[PDB]
Each structure stands twice: as structure tokens, then as C-alpha cells.
Design a protein around this ligand. Structure first.
Ligand SMILES: *[C@@H]1O[C@H](CO)[C@@H](O[C@@H]2O[C@H](CO)[C@@H](O[C@H]3O[C@H](CO[C@H]4O[C@H](CO)[C@@H](O)[C@H](O)[C@@H]4O)[C@@H](O)[C@H](O[C@H]4O[C@H](CO)[C@@H](O)[C@H](O)[C@@H]4O)[C@@H]3O)[C@H](O)[C@H]2NC(C)=O)[C@H](O)[C@H]1NC(C)=O
Ligand SMILES: *[C@@H]1O[C@H](CO)[C@@H](O)[C@H](O)[C@H]1NC(C)=O
Ligand SMILES: [Cl-]
Lengths: 36, 284, 259
């Protein structure tokens, strides 16, 4: 039942946790919008 | 203060009593001293209990003060670094129960010829052990058992002839191993185990290359990029690997990583790889 | 990774390096999904057609790295393998269907700024993020070009590489290769008429294809670098193991024994 690590998964100490964004993650987010 | 130099910053106090012909610790120093430099004095004998106060002392330098007797009495629950190098100790001091938060111990260049039974008992936080320049001939079995967190071990320039087959047992974080300039002729069965060793110094030894130098033979092969030649400090032994520095009989041209075991048993167990060709090409 | 760029420090804290003990060599990528579980591509461990069959004792796992070859002091952590689990129906004979394997670390590893686990997608997340056009991210220390044939440039990087690629619609993936595709894989990469380039390459398998959820701001691993034909060639696409579709097998081994 227990894995040890989740619930905290996917949140990067040097980025999300510090409210900082990496240089290209914006490219990913912009692709979630219909490009026509 | 009138004898040693005092400085503060970051809240840590650092007192420097180097080269002041002291035979004992000066008249009351800052109770909040963290760093204490008592190098090059005349502390033939020294009592740790004499530092009992200064409960914020983390680094203690008693090197080059020709100490032959260290009285391990009181406790320094916050002492992390302890330099005892370049002294006259003939017996390794039992710092277990006295220095629990110790992580760096340097008893290099003393007069050690052997190590106690439970020599390091109680130093579970030890990260670096320096015993270079002594005259150890053999290391006791289980010497590093109490120090599972060890990251660096220096046993260079001693009188070691053979190492305990299970010396490196545990050591999940060992990255540096210095055994250069000793009297080593071979390496036990699985001495290096499965752990990856980033920096090893094995040069300056009379390796006897026969049939039981094969384990070490292949290890060198696999770890060709992790064998370096010690030069000095500030150099950062991360400059150009050099596996060839390990030579048979210390006989220059006879690197051990190129010794065909000619007529040696089991034609496939020790050094049985080197099966395929490779053509790597990384950059700056 | 071909036509990607150097990763920022801690940009992909879940990145894992599968290291061979003897001889010492990087053999594949992988990802950390918990303090004791690592996910990779099955063929990184077992591929009979090339006589490849690696056991627990033949490998080490390096976590928290950035540089490809430099040992990184109190940054990377080196762990041993307790057990290797390859999908029982991994198809190495024809197309690497179900190219996945789980690795159980001998001891749990502590997280840090450089070491942190990635999330595994849930029903809604999968259905929501896996759409053609949507971009994911692939990371790895694999080849920078096709190295089996003369080509200009360095073969491998000195630092971890990263590239963002669009998911491709199945029909397009299917008609770009003669190899038989399954629902257990997907492909990504820029089409001939999009201009931008980028792809995984040899040495990148096991590496993760990740996407950030606009909903909870978490990173999820949607794929595992599995295969391709050449690297970054026009009209060709990199193929990845579809993690969500194998979710049931993953949970079953993960939660199989106590802890
Ligand atoms: C990938 O490679 C692996 C090794 O690199 C392969 O595993 C190895 O397979 C061989 C068989 O070819 C194993 O042989 C020895 O073990 C078997 C028993 O097998 C079971 O018990 C082992 C533990 O004792 C496990 O390790 C096995 O996984 C398995 O559970 C014995 O029967 C053999 O004995 C034979 O040889 C001795 C002399 O050496 C004779 O005295 C006997 O009479 C008999 O003839 C071996 O002792 C080997 O142990 C095993 N090693 C490992 C790490 O598993 C693996 O099969 C391969 N995978 C694929 C898909 O190809
Ligand atoms: C250790 O080696 C040194 C260097 O040759 C030598 O002078 C010394 O006598 C040796 N010590 C012992 C105990 O033999
Ligand atoms: Cl490959």
C-alpha cells in the first residue's frame, strides 16, 4: 500500500517548490491550447 | 584575546593561537568559540576536558604541536573536525564516547604502528579518516564497521603489506581511497566489492603480479578511469586519470592492467571481459 | 537526445542513470517513482536478439546526476538493485511491445534538491494530457546523432540533455514505420512540415517522457523512451512505452510485497 515518495511527486525542489519556472516549461503549457 | 587572535562572523567565533609557544590552552577564550587553532605549540600532553566549556567548539586544530599524549576526558558534542596530524602519537586515541559529532579525523604523520581493537567505536558520523604517513603494517578486521558513513579513507605512506579482504564492507558512500606508497603486493578476493570508487590511488606499491593478482587485474581494467596519481593539495585529483600508475613490482613499465596471467587457473572468471570494441566521443 | 539542449540543474530530479559495473558504462536512462522504485525500458535489461541479459548484480543506479561522467560529490547517490521486474509479456521478438521493467532499490534513497520522484498518471490525467499536438519532455544522456555511421559532431553530451516534443496521432505514427505498433506505445516528434526538430536516440531508452499537469502543477511520466529508426530523421518518430496502459501491472508488482 505504501510507496514512499508520492503525494509530493512531480514537484521539483528547485522549481515548483521555489515558485520558479524552468526555461522551456512554457512551451509545454502553450501546447495545451488549440493551435488551430 | 591578548595572546591569540579572535574573529567573529556568521555568529561563529574563531580563535587562533598558532605558534605561540603554548604548553596549555591560553587564559579563558570566548565562551562562544567555534574554531580553535592551537597549531605549532608545545602541547606534549593535552587534556580534552580542558575544553569542556566553549560548548560551541566544532573545529579543533592540534597539529604540529608535538603531542604524544592526548587525554580524552570531557566531551565536545559539537566538535566536527579534529586535526592531530604531524604529532608524536604512538597509540591512536579512543575518541568514540567523547566526540560523537566528529565527522573529520586526521591523525596523519604520527607514530602509529597498529590500530586498537574497537579503534573507531562510536564515531558513526565519521566521513573522513586520515592516517597517512604513519607506520601501520596491518589493519584490523572491522576497522570501519563503526563508520558506515565514511566517504574518504587515506592510508597512504604507511608500511602496509596486505589489506583485510573485508576492509571496505559497508561503506555505501566511499568515493576516495588512498593506498599509495605502501608495501602492497596484492589485493584480496572481493576487496573492492560492488561499490563504485570515483578516486583511488594505488601507485607506489610493489605489486607482485602472479595468478592471484587477477581480481585486482580486472578491477583496474574496469576502473581504469578512477585511478589517479597523488601530487599534492589544491590540485583536485580530478585531473587526468592514470590507471597505468599501478605497476607490477612497482616496476615502472609493468602496469598491472596489462598483465596476461599466462598459465593461471580458471580461464574465465577474473578479467574475462574486454569482449567488444567501443568508439566513444563526448565533448567539453 | 538529438537537437535538444543542456538541462538546468535540478530540472529533472527524477532522472536516473543505469550504470553497468563491468565494464563501467552508461547503458540506459530511467526514472525514480518513489524512494525505492525505478522505472525503465525492459530492453535495457533483456534483449535476447543481441544476447543482452543484465541481472541485479550487473548494475548500479546513479541518481541526482547532471554531468554524464563526472562523479558528483554530495549531489548524486549511487544505489544497488534488490530486484528486477520485467513485464511477463514484454515482446522482444518483434516490436518491443510492453517495453517496461521496474527496479527495486536495495535501500531507500533520500530526496534532495537533485533527487525527487516523478508522478505516475491517473485515469483523468492520462485521458486529459495524452492528445496529439500536446508537448511532452524527454531527457537523457544518450547519443547526439546517429553514431553507427560517419557524421559530424560529438557522439554524446557532457551534460544531461532535454527536448520538448509533440505527441503524434496514431495514424501518422503507424504509416511512418513498417514495424507493427500497438496500443501499448505512442510516438512523438515534429512532423516534416513543422520545422522544429528533436528526438531521443540510442542511449536514451528507459528515460522518461514527462508532461506538466496544468491542473495541479505536477509532473507526470506518460512514457518511457523505447525505440525508433535512426534519430531525428524526417517523417520518422520516436516511440515510447505507454505507461498508463501498463498501470495495472505496475501497481501489482509495486504493492506486491510489504512496504
Ligand atoms: C540471464 O543471465 C543469468 C545469469 O547471468 C541467468 O541466470 C543463471 O542461470 C543459470 C542456469 O543457466 C543458473 O545456474 C545455477 O543455478 C541453478 C538453479 O537455478 C535457480 O537457483 C539459482 C540459485 O541457486 C538462481 O540463481 C536461479 O535464478 C534459479 O532460481 C542450478 O540448477 C545450476 O546448477 C547446475 O550447475 C552446477 C554446477 O555449477 C551443477 O552442480 C548442478 O548439478 C547443475 O547442473 C547452477 O548452480 C544461475 O544460478 C543463474 N544465475 C542467476 C543470477 O540467476 C538467467 O537465466 C538469464 N536469463 C535469461 C532470460 O536468459
Ligand atoms: C616503514 O617504512 C619506512 C620507509 O622505508 C622505514 O624507514 C621504517 O623502518 C618502516 N617501519 C617499520 C615499523 O618497519
Ligand atoms: Cl542502444
Amino acid at each position: 500500500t505504501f510507496g514512499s515518495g508520492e503525494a509530493d511527486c512531480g514537484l521539483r525542489p528547485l522549481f515548483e517548490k521555489k515558485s520558479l519556472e524552468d526555461k522551456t516549461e512554457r512551451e509545454l503549457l502553450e501546447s495545451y491550447i488549440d493551435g488551430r | 584575546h591578548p595572546i591569540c587572535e579572535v574573529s567573529k562572523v556568521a555568529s561563529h567565533l574563531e580563535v587562533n593561537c598558532d605558534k605561540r609557544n603554548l604548553t596549555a590552552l591560553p587564559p579563558d577564550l570566548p565562551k562562544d568559540t567555534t574554531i580553535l587553532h592551537l597549531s605549532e605549540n608545545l602541547l606534549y600532553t593535552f587534556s580534552l576536558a580542558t575544553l569542556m566549556p566553549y560548548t560551541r567548539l566544532t573545529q579543533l586544530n592540534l597539529d604540529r604541536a608535538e603531542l604524544t599524549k592526548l587525554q580524552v576526558d570531557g566531551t565536545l558534542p559539537v566538535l566536527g573536525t579534529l586535526d592531530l596530524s604531524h604529532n608524536q602519537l604512538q597509540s591512536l586515541p579512543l575518541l568514540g564516547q567523547t566526540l560523537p559529532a566528529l565527522t573529520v579525523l586526521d591523525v596523519s604523520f604520527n607514530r602509529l604502528t597498529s590500530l586498537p581493537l574497537g579503534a573507531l567505536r562510536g564515531l558513526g558520523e565519521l566521513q573522513e579518516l586520515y592516517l597517512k604517513g604513519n607506520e601501520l603494517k596491518t589493519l584490523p578486521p572491522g576497522l570501519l564497521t563503526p563508520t558506515p558513513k565514511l566517504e574518504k579513507l587515506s592510508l597512504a605512506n604507511n608500511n602496509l603489506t596486505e589489506l583485510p579482504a573485508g576492509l571496505l564492507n559497508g561503506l555505501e558512500n566511499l568515493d576516495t581511497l588512498l593506498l599509495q606508497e605502501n608495501s602492497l603486493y596484492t589485493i584480496p578476493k572481493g576487496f573492492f566489492g560492488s561499490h563504485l570508487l570515483p578516486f583511488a590511488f594505488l601507485h607506489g606499491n610493489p605489486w607482485l603480479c602472479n595468478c592471484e593478482i587477477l581480481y585486482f587485474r580486472r578491477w583496474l581494467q574496469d576502473n581504469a578511469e578512477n585511478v589517479y596519481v597523488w601530487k599534492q593539495g589544491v590540485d583536485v585529483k580530478a585531473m587526468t586519470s592514470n590507471v597505468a600508475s599501478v605497476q607490477c613490482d612497482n616496476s615502472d613499465k609493468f602496469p598491472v592492467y596489462k598483465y596476461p596471467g599466462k598459465g593461471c587457473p580458471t580461464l574465465g572468471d577474473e578479467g574475462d571481459t574486454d569482449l567488444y570494441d567501443y568508439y566513444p566521443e563526448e565533448d567539453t | 537526445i538529438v537537437e535538444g539542449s543542456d538541462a538546468e540543474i535540478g530540472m529533472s530530479p527524477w532522472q536516473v542513470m543505469l550504470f553497468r559495473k563491468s565494464p563501467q558504462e552508461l547503458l540506459c536512462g530511467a526514472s525514480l517513482i518513489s524512494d525505492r522504485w525505478v522505472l525503465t525500458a525492459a530492453h535495457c535489461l533483456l534483449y535476447p536478439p543481441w544476447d543482452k541479459n543484465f541481472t541485479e548484480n550487473d548494475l548500479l543506479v546513479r541518481i541526482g546526476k547532471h554531468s554524464r561522467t563526472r562523479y558528483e560529490r554530495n549531489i548524486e547517490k549511487i544505489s544497488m538493485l534488490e530486484k528486477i521486474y520485467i513485464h511477463p509479456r514484454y515482446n522482444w521478438r518483434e516490436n518491443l511491445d510492453r517495453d517496461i521493467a521496474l527496479m527495486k532499490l536495495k535501500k531507500p534513497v533520500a530526496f534532495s534538491d537533485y533527487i525527487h520522484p516523478v508522478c505516475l498518471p491517473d485515469r483523468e490525467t492520462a485521458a486529459s494530457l495524452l492528445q496529439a499536438g500536446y508537448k511532452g519532455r524527454v531527457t537523457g544522456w544518450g547519443n547526439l546523432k546517429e553514431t553507427w555511421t560517419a557524421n559530424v559532431g560529438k557522439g554524446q553530451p557532457s551534460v544531461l540533455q532535454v527536448v520538448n516534443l509533440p505527441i503524434v496521432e496514431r495514424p501518422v505514427c503507424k504509416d511512418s514505420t513498417r514495424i507493427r505498433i500497438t496500443d501499448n506505445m505512442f510516438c512523438a516528434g515534429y512532423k516534416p512540415d513543422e520545422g522544429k526538430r528533436g528526438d531521443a536516440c540510442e542511449g536514451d531508452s528507459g528515460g522518461p517522457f514527462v508532461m506538466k499537469s496544468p491542473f495541479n502543477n505536477r509532473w507526470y511520466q506518460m512514457g518511457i523512451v523505447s525505440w525508433g529508426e535512426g534519430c531525428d530523421r524526417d517523417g520518422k518518430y520516436g516511440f515510447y512505452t505507454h505507461v498508463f496502459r501498463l498501470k495495472k501491472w505496475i501497481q501489482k508488482v509495486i504493492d506486491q510485497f510489504g512496504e
